[PDB]
Design a protein around this ligand. Structure first.
Ligand SMILES: [Mg+2]
Ligand SMILES: [Mg+2]
Lengths: 227, 225
DNA sequence: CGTGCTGACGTCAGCACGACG
DNA sequence: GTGCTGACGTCAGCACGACG
């Protein structure tokens, strides 16, 4: 019926990095926003046209970190994120190390199981990358026993509530289509995490149902690249 | 002199709890916002009357957690924070436990040293309460080696830019500097951001003051035992 | 009876390039 | 390389009611 059961926690995830998948990129900034199932069900369903941007739930756990990469950012990436290896290193940020894994483990162990990660284009980007960054380490994966889904597929599925042109599923395109405003704090880890949360809160009940149906273990995601 | 060196990181801190010091209160929500020295110094300079609310730095490590207490919130505490033991437990939030200490340790270890906490009224409330919660645990204090200060003291100091009986509550100071109300009132993160704005008013002066007044968190005495 | 139309489904070659930083 | 899409082959379902 439901592989793995009803998800008790969604953790909304977004990464910034040195560049794109060709480039064997490294993670520059990470954000996690953990929301319990109830919290999301209790989102208000008060929708005219346009419906207002849903207000985040009161109760939320959040983690936002900047990470020094082992290589420079592409000029392109450093433009759009507002980050650079020079600046992270003059500010004393660390690499993606075992210590960061211990942090992530403890954050996740505070969330009730089962537990699903949620990232826009996460099947192709955030989950492989993270998997690579984590395999490098001496510790055991903090993400073992955790599940994951991609919000593009979620929102594609959900826009079977209505047929014009074939339309974009980029984070921004979706937000604007649904709420008729520009989103904000673009290409900062937390900012896009909050945008993502807003689009998932559009139809909470339907989303959870779909997450429950399509959730798969993080341990099956294959690394973007190796060594 | 400068008793412990230049502080390389400021961690802005704020708690919500089940009540006030005469209850033996427990922590319900906790936010840490870590900003490097340089990131503070690179804040754009306040000018004009009022000056605009400074924009937070780009580079920031942030932690926000809700925590289930072992006892009920007071009616007053629940109203003002928007949190209640019932709601925290239906949502599966945990106690302040050994695992949370590990978490906090790892967060702090990611910050360059020396490192100072900053809390509004922390000398009387946040630091002792935190000290209390930590002493209950089987682990060592994650805050060994970390320093602390109170922002009420710093902001008193800094407002002898004028030459004079004001209120030094968080909202009073903000309204005084920026002529606006602050926004997400009595949510751990909200008031941390409001605190950061305050501290970004005269970034240089503040860091000077923090360097002179930072003291070890180990010397803070618990609220209760 | 067979014959032969129709609509549903799974497959695959061909085509336009998304969507992450 | 990915990820839609339309063309094609296949198959199950359905309509015929023919005759002495
Ligand atoms: Mg994204
Ligand atoms: Mg306070």
């Amino acid at each position: 019926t439901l592989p793995h059961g009803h998800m008790q926690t969604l953790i909304f995830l977004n990464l910034e990095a040195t560049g794109l998948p060709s480039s064997r990129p490294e993670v520059t900034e990470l954000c996690l926003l953990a929301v319990h199932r109830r919290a999301l069900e209790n989102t208000s369903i008060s929708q005219g046209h346009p419906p207002p941007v849903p207000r985040p739930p009161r109760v939320v756990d959040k983690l936002s970190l900047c990470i020094a990469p082992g290589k420079a950012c592409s000029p392109g990436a450093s433009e759009i994120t507002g980050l650079s290896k020079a600046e992270l290193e003059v500010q004393g940020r660390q690499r993606f190390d075992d210590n960061l894994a211990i942090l992530l483990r403890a954050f996740l162990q505070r969330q009730p199981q089962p537990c699903c990660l949620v990232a826009h284009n996460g099947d192709r980007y955030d989950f492989p990358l993270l998997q690579t960054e984590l395999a490098r380490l001496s510790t055991p994966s903090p993400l073992d026993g955790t599940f994951c889904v991609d919000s593009i597929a979620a929102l594609k599925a959900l826009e079977q509530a209505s047929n014009g042109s074939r339309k974009s599923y980029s984070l921004g395109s979706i937000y604007t289509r649904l709420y008729w405003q520009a989103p904000t704090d673009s290409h900062t880890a937390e900012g896009d995490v909050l945008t993502l949360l807003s689009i998932c809160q559009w139809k909470p009940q339907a989303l959870l149902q779909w997450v429950d149906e399509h959730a798969r273990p993080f341990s099956t995601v294959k690394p973007m690249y190796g060594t």
